[PDB]
Amino acid sequence: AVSFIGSTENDVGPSQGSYSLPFVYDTGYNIGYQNANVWHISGGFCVGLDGKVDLPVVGSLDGQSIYGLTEEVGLLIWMGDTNYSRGTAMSGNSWENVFSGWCVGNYVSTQGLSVHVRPVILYSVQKTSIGSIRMRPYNGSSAGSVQTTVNFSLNPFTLNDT
Numbered sequence: 001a002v003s004f005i006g007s008t009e010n011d012v013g014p015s016q017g018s019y020s021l022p023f024v025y026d027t028g029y030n031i032g033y034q035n036a037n038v039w040h041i042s043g044g045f046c047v048g049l050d051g052k053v054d055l056p057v058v059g060s061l062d063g064q065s066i067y068g069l070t071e072e073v074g075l076l077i078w079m080g081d082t083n084y085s086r087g088t089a090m091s092g093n094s095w096e097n098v099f100s101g102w103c104v105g106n107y108v109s110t111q112g113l114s115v116h117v118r119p120v121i122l123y124s125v126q127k128t129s130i131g132s133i134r135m136r137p138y139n140g141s142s143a144g145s146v147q148t149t150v151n152f153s154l155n156p157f158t159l160n161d162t
């Protein structure tokens with residue numbers, strides 16, 4: 001069994017927030033969103049995760065896409081399971097597997113996710129739509145007609161440059 005228990009729209013990173021080429025502001029996992037309970041799963045239900053970044057790919061760095069916000073600022077993006085360190089560097093604008101998934105036993109548990117980004121200097125940024133994450137039922141399991149996708153928006157912030 002499965003049911004949706006999270007929020008549809010989700011803000012990424014704390015509002016306002018101030019931070020001090022291309023240069024990568026290493027903010028760790030601070031500019032992100034994390035929720036371990038987005039879905040309610042039970043009875044051998046198997047689920048994984050797919051991620052999608054809608055921002056334009058303005059470049060590539062060490063393998064992952066540099067998504068653009070402004071002609072001056074860009075982002076590196078990670079999506080995946082609940083724990084931050086278990087993310088997947090995002091590349092492109094297509095649905096990608098960001099978490100291979102698991103299967104809950106004969107009991108009640110949940111499926112979460114996490115998302116974090118890092119500023120990239122190519123200042124201030126206005127809140128912008130980032131992308132989405134969808135649960136991926138498998139091994140026979142199906143989403144039925146329960147909400148499968150959630151979205152993410154980056155809260156405005158500023159980079160105290162040099």
Ligand SMILES: CC(=O)N[C@@H]1[C@@H](O)[C@H](O)[C@@H](CO)O[C@H]1O
Nearest residue numbers: 036037081082102110111112113
């Ligand atoms: C701890 C919790 O509430 N449920 C977690 C869920 O967030 C996570 O997505 C899943 C797969 O790793 O493992 C569950 O145990």
